[PDB]
Amino acid sequence: KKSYTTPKKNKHKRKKVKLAVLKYYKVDENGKISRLRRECPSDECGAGVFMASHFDRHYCGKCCLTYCFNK
Amino acid sequence: AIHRIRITLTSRNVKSLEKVCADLIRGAKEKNLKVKGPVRMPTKTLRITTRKTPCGEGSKTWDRFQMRIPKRLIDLHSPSEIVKQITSISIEPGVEVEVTIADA
């Protein structure tokens, strides 16, 4: 038939990052939780919904996985 | 009730349609009322013409798949007994029976 050469750029299958994720939660002295950064406008993602700094991206993850913006 | 009943007999088997068709005449004329006998529509020929060959090849021979469907119909005037007697009797094989109420 042919036998596939492939231009030597074997594309990455990627991990979605490891991440413990939930350590960064400011417990100021007694039990109370609220940090500030950027926010999403969705309903299931109600006010707590939380954002970022990447090489750009930022995303919100709380209408289960329904609804990540474009920034 | 006395209303303008049409019985429309549609079936494939001419013989097993005209045993029923005769039994509605002989079923109504038993308990006489009226009729205007069996009407004979043109028979509709369901004609398909496909290749004999699955796949390509061989000299091109096709079959000529046919199904007929003759319609008789019989007018009458009766109550809700003579209809529900004559229709439910003389059923059985591959025969479809319609029952128009009146006129339209």
Binding site: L22, Y25, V27, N30, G31, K32, I33, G48 | -
Partner: protein
């Protein structure tokens, strides 16, 4: 059968809440359940590195919508909730540590729910 042994009164309520689909099961959903009436019952871990995480639990738990228990050990805290796919007949199933869930919509009623939530609200 099903007459409540030791640390198996929380186990039937967790196994029936598991299967009734509604467990606010962790620091996050636990706290967003305790933030609303979404919370009901819970099982916290005695062992907890940086016990700010057990404190966020305790502090919310102790508010109106009164929760608590204790249950010693991280290493036990899950296998009376839902977390095994049968693979291997003698159950060696899984194995890291365990911590703070929030049991919602119990399961249906009875079994262990008149045992633990009559005994917790009135420990006498």
């Amino acid at each position: 059968g099903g007459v409540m042994d030791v640390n198996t009164a929380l186990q039937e309520v967790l196994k029936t809440a598991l299967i009734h689909d509604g467990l606010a099961r962790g620091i996050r959903e636990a706290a967003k359940a305790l933030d609303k009436r979404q919370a009901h019952l819970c099982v916290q871990a005695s062992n907890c590195d940086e016990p700010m995480y057990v404190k966020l639990v305790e502090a919310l738990l102790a508010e109106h919508q009164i929760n608590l228990i204790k249950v010693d050990d991280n290493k036990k805290l899950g296998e009376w909730v839902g977390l095994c796919k049968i693979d291997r007949e003698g159950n060696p199933r899984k194995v890291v540590g365990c911590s703070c869930v929030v049991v919602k919509d119990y399961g249906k009623e009875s079994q262990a729910k008149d045992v633990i939530e009559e005994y917790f609200k009135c420990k006498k």
